[PDB]
Nucleic acid binder design. Structure first.
Ligand SMILES: [Mg+2]
Ligand SMILES: [Mg+2]
Ligand SMILES: [Mg+2]
Ligand SMILES: [Mg+2]
Ligand SMILES: [Mg+2]
Ligand SMILES: [Mg+2]
Ligand SMILES: [Mg+2]
Ligand SMILES: [Mg+2]
Ligand SMILES: [Mg+2]
Ligand SMILES: [Mg+2]
Ligand SMILES: [Mg+2]
Ligand SMILES: [Mg+2]
Ligand SMILES: [Mg+2]
Ligand SMILES: [Mg+2]
Ligand SMILES: [Mg+2]
Ligand SMILES: [Mg+2]
Ligand SMILES: [Mg+2]
Ligand SMILES: [Mg+2]
Ligand SMILES: [Mg+2]
Ligand SMILES: [Mg+2]
Ligand SMILES: [Mg+2]
Ligand SMILES: [Mg+2]
Ligand SMILES: [Mg+2]
Ligand SMILES: [Mg+2]
Lengths: 83, 100, 117, 210, 127, 100, 115
RNA sequence: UUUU
RNA sequence: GUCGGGCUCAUAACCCGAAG
RNA sequence: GGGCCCGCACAAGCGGUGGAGCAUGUGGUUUAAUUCGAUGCAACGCGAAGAACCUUACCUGGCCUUGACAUACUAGAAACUUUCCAGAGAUGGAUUGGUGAAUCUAGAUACAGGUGCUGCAUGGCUGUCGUCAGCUCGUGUCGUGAGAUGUUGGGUUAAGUCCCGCAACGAGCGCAACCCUUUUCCUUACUUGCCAGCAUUUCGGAUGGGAACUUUAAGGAUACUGCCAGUGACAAACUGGAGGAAGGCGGGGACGACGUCAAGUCAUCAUGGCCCUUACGGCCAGGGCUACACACGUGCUACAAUGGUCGGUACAAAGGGUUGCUACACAGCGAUGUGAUGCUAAUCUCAAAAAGCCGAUCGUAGUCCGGAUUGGAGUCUGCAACUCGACUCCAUGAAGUCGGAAUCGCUAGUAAUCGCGGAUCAGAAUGCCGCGGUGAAUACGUUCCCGGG
């Protein structure tokens, strides 16, 4: 994990988008390729569509998804079985 | 290598050399202790707001003549294929075939 | 090989000046840990010295021809371990005193060959 | 197959290096890449001449290059326009005041470079490869060599399946390290592809070591 | 009355200074038992002086460096015999018969390109 | 004062003659040479794959050695520093002249 | 001889016998025995019934068998329900820490299956 | 013991 | 009988193990 | 299709693999993609001496069109350097200084570009038989002639090595030798390395000093059946022994004949031919190369008492260090952090060698063996460790009690076992290439298996 003496890492364009949306109480999903930014306690409530390689999957931020990386909630590989 | 790869490398190291002083002084401001914490947080912000290609971690060593990304030797600046050819014909000073 | 070869000679052990003792502790050694091996055999010898007082180099070569040389020295190093007595220096110095008085572990091990002889 | 290179196997034995300079392990690469450029530029800047060897030295933050050519009159021209302009070209590459020395080759039939270059320039005019090979072998043995081998490889005579043809006259002891042996390779760019010429020339043994 | 010998074994040196006196030893400013905990290295060191039956007529001042236990013990033995035959050359036949005069030239053989360790090659398999 | 001369080179045939040409030149213009001491040699070695595509156990092993020699001149006269600085030395030898 | 609802071996040194409680390793056993004031080489057999009470007091300060088992089994449930990468790797019983699965995962996957 |  | 492993430059015979 | 001879080829021994868990490459399967190549021995820890972005060749989306790069033409502007807005970024817009060669910008035709195809069109490079012992010529002689002899036969040798018989006599390339390193000694050299004999000691070669010894590294000497005895054909060679550090090739490396396999490589590079040219070229962000019912190859760690843990105490070689290595001090359980010293190195540093020795404990238990897997809390590199890093701490504590048929490596400082270093590299080795410590067992023999002459 990232060092605690550096703080959490959030992208700058994503943080601008989130702070802009939180002031207007909008409901439109935020589309982003970030996938590596940390989920801040401010994100809780919003709907973020994160890239997964081919599509942008919608994610609803819950009070328990704080501290994870965005890409944790958008898997990349497809697998059903082998038989 | 293809001719776009060599220009990509030239592009990257040109941009690295352009942004050396600023990145270094931001790295110094961050690692300081007698500055404000807001100082050392705005320094962090301005550091990771540079272009991606300004970081020397994205530089890959290639053969000086052909441009091969594998089998590189830092002492020589060439990859193994041209190293064998220029050594075995006598153009590299000091190098001989080794026997213990 | 295909033409001919000679055999190698062994410096006799430095404490009792014997060659058979050196060859015996060369069968007990593994991984080049010769300190462990010489501790084991010297302990066995200085054990059989204080009990049933007799010269060790004599008692050893007396009990060897009871079991007979390499294949003889293998049965001793084997049947002394599968014994569950104590430290190896003590369950090796146990099979020697067993085989001297005609025991069944390594002494009467070769007797099984005498039946099928 | 897979023989060792005749020159590099005896580089501290009976052969010197073609580069003579020292550099600290962080300056070695810049020097190496700066004189590889000088070689790769001089080999074509002097293609019509008969250059056979190029020696590079760096005495006291300087640059000295000895060009051992078979016809210095062309690499110099009139006295004062080719050696004086070449030097102004070898500084833009070396970044240091360069010097150019000339070493005229007497008997230019005992160095494998010139024999190979001649055989290639003949093969690139549609001459029978056997004629050229035999002529070179015959013309070098008269100049005093104690042995010569020539090798030609690849789609000979405009054919469709490639093959190798070699020719020898004399002794060429390749396993004797005190035997000095000149060796060269060259490429012929024919209407059907590449042809490879290899030349070994033997001139006697060396007594005394280094 | 101070004679000197030098003995190599594998990578050890063993500078040995032999002189007249009672029987006392030092190895690297350390008595014989303080230096070799291996009890059979001591009886390699004490072999030449007990061969001639003397064992008590000589003082020995030894230094040694390089190598391991067995290497340094054999080096010291070699050096002691070479310091001994420097005093009285007459003893050289006897010391030759016990095999103390020969320098053991066996060294570690280098690892080779494409093998595990100098003679051991990787595991072979067909099909 | 004192002079220390350190010589570094890739060729020892050359370093020997440079050293023994400096020593006698100093001996002519005075005295007090402290000999060409040989310092231990650096040997770095490389393994180079000789095939273009795939053959791991087929490699050429190359080697380069650096030789170092040391010379001291203890009490030099007023005509030795010039007799030394007025000396041309062949290529492939690095000469470091130091006072302390 | 009976601590934290477990029967610990009696003919054993104390620092070795205290590790039979789920949740107590060797470091924690050393800490407990030092805090209470008992040497590590003392057998559980040689302990007065008035020292065992201070041992139980000190053990009660760290999580043990049932509390800890339930604590572990709740985090995995939370992960599996939230729906992150690790919860998914837990549902499918595959390595969660980045190991390879093309081969060598037989401790998470179990005995082999024919086809 | 079948095939090159 | 089948599936897997072994022997073979390949293949079968044969050998080992397993499931049923 | 027969005969002889040789090689860890078999036999004799020692230790493994096949069984377990993990690492790594491959096949298959899955996928948007899981980039491409290498397939008996001679592909499978192989190209790759090191895929988080980059690498990157692949996929999804967004973009450019004489182009990221060259040459020849025209017109305008010193290159260069600040501040900001949109955008995931590519990319567009706006601002600040600056005043004929170089140096950007705009337009335009030939062209550039292609890791696209053919290794069965090729050059160069490599594997393999195999360091196997063969491949030839000129004469002089035989067969009308193509050709043969030489080179075949008895021994011997690592060897077409040598001796001997021989219509052959000689000679060449291969074998050996010349080159590197190790073992003994000698000479020159005396610091940053050394400390025998003096003194001084704050006990530290530390300091007056000394040039002996160790070492450092350059040049020499020495081994040839030279001496003795036998065997042997007046032979070659072999067996013994005296000296000698060493004895018959003292040990190891490098060096790979003529040729075989349309062997491998158009993806290092070059190149004939074919194909694409608002795309099969070029620039980005995110994903993938790390997937997982399975099968195989190569490794690592164990199943313990010749051992595990804890306390004390010894003995190396070879390598690396200025964008680097760090004495020492403080903080922390620790990974590490802060300060601060020496070092461009025989000077300072990595750095602790580890197995070993002495003492205590565990007493044959799935254990004080074993460490997989999982939960929780951290450190560091980096713009960023979700997919997908390494390391530290606490807890958890699988399988495993020596492995079926079968199969592999090794002939001596070797096998076995124990640590140390480097190349690649910001970070990322159980791989690769090296270094020393401890240090064995066995070889009657050539019927059999495999390859070769
Ligand atoms: Mg290209
Ligand atoms: Mg990189
Ligand atoms: Mg070893
Ligand atoms: Mg060595
Ligand atoms: Mg197999
Ligand atoms: Mg427990
Ligand atoms: Mg062998
Ligand atoms: Mg066998
Ligand atoms: Mg291809
Ligand atoms: Mg391998
Ligand atoms: Mg245009
Ligand atoms: Mg081919
Ligand atoms: Mg080819
Ligand atoms: Mg011959
Ligand atoms: Mg040879
Ligand atoms: Mg083919
Ligand atoms: Mg192919
Ligand atoms: Mg092509
Ligand atoms: Mg990308
Ligand atoms: Mg892969
Ligand atoms: Mg344990
Ligand atoms: Mg079980
Ligand atoms: Mg055969
Ligand atoms: Mg033969």
């Amino acid at each position: 994990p990232r060092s605690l003496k550096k703080g959490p890492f959030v992208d700058a364009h994503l943080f601008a988008k989130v702070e802009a949306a939180v002031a207007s109480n909008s409901r439109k999903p935020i589309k982003t390729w970030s996938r590596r930014s940390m989920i801040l306690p401010d994100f809780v409530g919003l709907t973020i569509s994160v890239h997964n390689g081919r599509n942008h999957v919608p994610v609803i931020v819950t009070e328990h998804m704080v501290g994870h990386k965005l890409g944790e909630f958008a898997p990349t590989r497809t697998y059903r079985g082998h038989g | 290598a293809k001719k776009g790869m060599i220009n990509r490398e030239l592009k990257r190291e040109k941009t690295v050399a352009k942004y050396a002083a600023k990145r270094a002084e931001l790295k110094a401001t961050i690692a300081n202790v007698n500055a404000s914490d807001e100082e050392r947080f705005e320094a962090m912000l301005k550091l990771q707001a540079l272009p991606r290609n300004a970081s020397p971690v994205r530089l890959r060593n290639r053969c000086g003549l052909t441009g091969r990304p594998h089998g590189y030797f830092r002492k020589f600046g060439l990859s193994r294929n041209k190293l064998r050819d220029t050594v075995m014909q006598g153009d590299v000073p000091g190098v001989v075939k080794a026997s213990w | 090989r295909r033409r001919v070869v000679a055999a190698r000679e062994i410096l006799p052990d430095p404490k009792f000046s014997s060659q058979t003792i050196a060859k015996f502790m060369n069968h007990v050694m593994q991984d080049g840990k010769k300190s462990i091996a010489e501790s084991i055999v010297y302990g066995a010898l200085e054990r059989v010295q204080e009990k049933n007082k007799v010269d060790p180099v004599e008692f050893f070569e007396t009990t060897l021809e009871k079991v007979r040389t390499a294949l003889a020295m293998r049965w001793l190093v084997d049947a002394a371990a599968k014994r569950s007595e104590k430290t190896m220096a003590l369950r090796l110095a146990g099979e020697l005193l067993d085989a001297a008085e005609g025991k069944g572990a390594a002494i009467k091990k070769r007797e099984d060959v005498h039946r099928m002889a | 197959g897979q023989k060792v290179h005749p020159i590099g196997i005896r580089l501290g034995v009976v052969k010197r290096h073609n580069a003579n300079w020292y550099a600290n392990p962080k300056q070695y690469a810049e020097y190496l890449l700066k004189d590889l450029q000088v070689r790769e530029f001089l080999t074509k800047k002097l293609k019509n001449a008969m250059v056979s060897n190029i020696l590079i030295e760096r005495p006291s933050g300087a640059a000295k290059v000895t060009i051992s050519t078979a016809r210095p009159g062309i690499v110099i021209g009139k006295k004062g326009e080719d050696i004086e302009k070449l030097q102004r070209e070898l500084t833009n590459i070396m970044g240091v005041p360069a010097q150019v020395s000339i070493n005229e080759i007497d008997r230019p039939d005992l160095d494998a470079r010139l024999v190979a270059e001649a055989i290639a320039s003949q093969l690139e005019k549609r001459v029978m490869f056997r004629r050229a090979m035999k002529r070179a072998v015959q013309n070098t043995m008269r100049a005093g060599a104690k042995g010569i081998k020539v090798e030609v490889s690849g789609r000979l005579g405009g054919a469709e399946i490639a093959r190798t043809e070699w020719y020898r006259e004399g002794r060429v002891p390749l396993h004797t390290l005190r035997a000095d042996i000149d060796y060269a390779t060259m490429r012929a760019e024919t209407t059907y592809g590449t042809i490879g010429v290899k030349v070994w020339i033997f001139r006697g043994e060396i007594l005394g070591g280094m | 009355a101070t004679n000197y010998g030098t003995g190599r074994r594998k990578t050890a040196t063993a500078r040995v200074f032999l002189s007249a006196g009672t029987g006392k030893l030092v190895i690297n400013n350390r008595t014989l038992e303080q230096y070799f905990g291996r009890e059979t290295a001591r009886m390699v060191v004490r072999q030449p002086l007990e061969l001639l039956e003397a064992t008590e007529k000589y003082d020995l001042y030894i230094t040694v460096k390089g190598g391991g236990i067995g290497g340094q013990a054999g080096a010291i033995r070699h050096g002691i015999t070479r310091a001994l035959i420097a005093a009285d050359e007459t003893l050289k036949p006897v010391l030759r018969q016990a095999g103390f005069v020969t320098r053991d030239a066996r060294e570690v053989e280098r690892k080779k390109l494409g093998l595990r360790k100098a003679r051991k090659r990787p595991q072979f398999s067909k099909r | 004062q004192r002079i220390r001369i350190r010589l570094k080179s890739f060729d020892h045939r050359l370093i020997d003659q440079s050293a023994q040409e400096i020593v006698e030149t100093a001996k002519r213009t005075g005295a007090q040479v402290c000999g060409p001491i040989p310092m231990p040699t650096r040997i770095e070695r490389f393994n180079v794959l000789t095939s273009p595509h795939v053959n791991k156990d087929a490699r050429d092993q190359y080697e380069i050695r650096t030789y170092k020699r040391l010379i001291d001149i203890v009490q030099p006269t007023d005509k030795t520093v010039d007799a030394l600085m007025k000396l041309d030395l062949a290529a492939g030898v690095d000469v470091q002249i130091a006072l302390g | 001889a009976r601590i934290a609802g477990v029967n610990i071996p009696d003919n054993k040194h104390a620092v070795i016998s205290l590790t039979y409680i789920f949740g107590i390793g060797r470091h924690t056993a050393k800490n407990i025995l030092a805090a209470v004031g008992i040497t590590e080489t003392t057998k559980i057999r040689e302990l007065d019934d008035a020292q065992l009470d201070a041992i139980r007091a000190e053990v009660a300060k760290v999580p043990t068998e049932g509390d800890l088992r339930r604590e572990i089994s709740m985090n995995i449930k939370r992960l599996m329900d939230l729906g992150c990468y690790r919860g998914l790797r837990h549902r499918r019983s595959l390595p969660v820490r980045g190991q390879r699965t093309k081969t060598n995962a037989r401790t998470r996957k179990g005995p082999r299956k024919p086809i």
